[PDB]
Amino acid sequence: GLLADDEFPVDEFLNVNLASTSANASSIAFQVAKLGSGTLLDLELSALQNES
Amino acid sequence: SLDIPVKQVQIEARIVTVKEGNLEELGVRWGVMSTNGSHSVGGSIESNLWQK
């Protein structure tokens, strides 16, 4: 109950934040959310490969 | 001996130009969104946080 503003700290949530930084990168993301025992875990992969 | 009538010449230039061009592009846009009960699959982390 300690912090005042509570919608979701999307940036304070993440442990490892090393996303592929581009405009055409493709991703996919998996989740496990209980909310009864509290546990939540998220995992997203992203990639890109081009040629010219 | 000098002053005599001279000849006349007709000169005609011709400039020709021809251009051609071709272009082709193909693209794809797809997405998925699914939930299972404490399990989800999406295309980002904000996506999984929204379908909750």
From which experimental method does this structure derive?
A: cryo-EM
How would you class A27 by CB atoms within 10 Å of its CB: exposed for 0-12, middle for 13-18, buried for 19 or more? middle
**Contact residues, chain B, for A42 at CB < 8 Å:** 45, 48
3-state secondary structure of A11: helix
Residue of A nearest to B48 (CA): A31
Residue of A nearest to B41 (CA): A30
A26-33: strand order across its sheet: A40-47, A26-33, B39-42, B34-35
Partner-chain residue, chosen from B38, B45, B52, that has the shortest CB–CB distance to A29: B45
Smallest CA–CA distance, residue B12 to chain A, in Å, is 46
CB neighbour burial string for B31-43, b if at least 16 within 10 angstroms, e if fewer: eeeeeeeeebbbb
Q: List the beta bridge partners of residue B39.
A: A32
Q: Which two tokens stand for residue B27?
A: 């693209």
How would you class B48 by CB atoms within 10 Å of its CB: exposed for 0-12, middle for 13-18, buried for 19 or more? buried
Q: Do A44 and B44 touch (CB under 8 A)?
A: yes
